[PDB]
Amino acid sequence: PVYMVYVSQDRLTPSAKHAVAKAITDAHRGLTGAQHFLAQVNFQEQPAGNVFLGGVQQGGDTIFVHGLHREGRSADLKGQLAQRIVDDVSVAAEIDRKHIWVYFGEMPAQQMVEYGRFLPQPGHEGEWFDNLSSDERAFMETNVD
Template sequence: MPTYQVFMSPQCLSKESKQRVAQAITSTHHDVTGAANFFAQVIFNAKSAEDYYLGGSPLKAPHLFVHGHIRARSLEVKQQLAARLLDAVADAAQLDKRYVWIYISDLQPEVMVEFGYPLPPPGKEAEWMATLAPEDLAYMQGVDFKPPQNRS
């Protein structure tokens, strides 16, 4: 359901950092919206130095731009999500918050299809999942990650 695109400057994140950022985004989205972890996808897009500009000039510092496409939520939920994502992503990437930008965009669930099914409105996930074919539900739940208990 939510798709987060993370655009980053060259060599901004290691493989391990990407894993931490993906888990931070997934956990934060779940904590704020209640959506199951297996719905969240995080896609990293590394941009070369010649393809990333800020203010019309080539980027000079490590930078992450996180654009979340989520099912329509209230303004309050989106504000909370953006603020919590900023903290979580900056921590996971070990970057100062000034280098992490978060944008949240609404998508109407009526025009979204995932795992082969049209999506339900927010808050109707349990009823929706009850109508899915058992093999589709098993696949969906099989991609769920378990957040680490303790992170150093």
């Protein structure tokens, strides 16, 4: 999946971003079994005051996670995943949960490319990996922590 994380500039230090990226990555691997290296976290920083709530300009304490997934999981699994993201980014970023927004959008795995390869169904995770070339396997292998 790809997790677009829209935050205010400076509100997360490189350590906070790294903690937030780990929290979302570990939450996703935890509840879906998709390997670590398959989860992208992409911070989009914008100066404070670019976020408006009900027409009201905001300071730098808003966090909007927009997760982009493949289709095929149950509404229940997706509920738990968004809740665990909320709780684990609140902790990792030292921000209160009311400041956190989370949207999941889904697409067919047939129109999703990661590491230049079409993604498999969530009922295909392990077999897809074993049938990748060894140069690709190794390169993905590096993006784990």
